[PDB]
Symmetry: C3
């Protein structure tokens, strides 16, 4: 039956939806946090995505988007703020999609500055994968530890956080 | 012809099957190896996957699964065991699937412990991609070198090994 | 309508085309550049790919391939050549495909030598994502900074550069 084959394809195509979301972030010196700016964009794979600071779970659901991302300053990562070695990028996301979504990876890339330089010290990130069911809000704990203190000088605290999102699931 | 278009879609959907398999591992202090625990799970993309320690190639094929993963302690990586800086995660896999599969990437992520901390020293992994034909067994040599000695203290030897698996192929 | 559903599937399957291109490279000591060798290969996802050194944009378009990759020695990355700590792998690509393509990631993997060893010092890469429209030529600036000087000894300057290519797009 072509009808059931097409239905199968629909499901398989959905399971094949992959995406490395790029979120520009700022390691705010003395805060232990990676800050992200409110933005709205469209992904050919994930649809409408909106980053919204300071939203409670309920407020997130009022947003018109497929996915809403809200950073959380809950200190899910232990850090000595004054050292400026480890920064937390933890955020929660509301899955306003018809299928369970999975956040399973993160990489912190130093931004190349106008002088064509970038912070090249050791860069080691960690995170806790999370699967979020339809309409639910889940938290993706993540962060990065650098081999040398982060400073705002020469755009040294600017990064692009890439988060791997997938509808596959295990 | 719709018939041939559907056949084309079937092939293309198959080629688009991507997956980052998460395998929890323990860097066993003084062994130079990342140890994995026998487990059985289902991937929306790859199907039934089973990790089975101590299996010979023949034994792997007796397992009821789409893919069988078996770690190999063959010292495919040169290491001075007492230093606890480099650990090998080499494993072989039986492809019980209808298409050549490719293992082309690996990343070792430090596990965040209950105290909300994680090993943040330099973390550099290496591996040798391998393509495995239908019913064949192939070995994926891989390992990681850390900037500081690994210790079991505070869950410092616990990691999540992510292996990139794809049906694309080059 | 099955006709329009199939058309939708065609578009979605296309958007799901993902690929981690493996390009063997040599960090040429004293040059500040990752060198790649002319090669021609086929990707189940991306099609015919050809790496061609020294080609001008016009010359790239004369090549018979879906994608043409040409390294660019334009010092898009600031480096002190004699230190051998930072190497640039910047390259441009001609998109001879029917859809806008995106180059959004890069990882530099140390090659395991015959003696079963690999350079395990800190390894931190950076890059600037680029989207390339049909028939256009775009440049993907990228590079890596190592924790210790790179040397050709024991194949210590050999790597496999993995570049993430996707038709998704944001």
């Amino acid at each position: 039956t072509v009808t059931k084959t097409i239905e199968t394809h629909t499901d398989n195509i959905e399971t094949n939806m992959d995406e490395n979301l790029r979120i520009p972030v700022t390691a705010e010196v003395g805060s232990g946090y990676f800050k992200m700016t409110d933005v709205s964009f469209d992904s050919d794979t994930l649809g409408k995505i909106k980053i919204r600071n300071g939203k409670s779970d309920a407020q997130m659901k009022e947003e018109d988007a497929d996915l809403v991302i809200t950073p959380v300053e809950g200190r899910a990562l232990e850090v000595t703020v004054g050292q400026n070695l480890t920064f937390e990028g933890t955020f929660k996301v509301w899955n306003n999609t018809s299928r369970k979504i999975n956040i399973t990876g993160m990489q912190m890339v130093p931004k190349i500055n106008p002088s064509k330089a970038f912070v090249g010290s050791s860069n080691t990130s960690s995170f806790t994968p999370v699967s979020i069911d339809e309409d639910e809000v889940g938290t993706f704990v993540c962060g990065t530890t650098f081999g040398a203190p982060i400073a705002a000088t020469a755009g040294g605290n600017l990064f692009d956080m890439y988060v791997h999102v997938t509808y596959s699931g295990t």
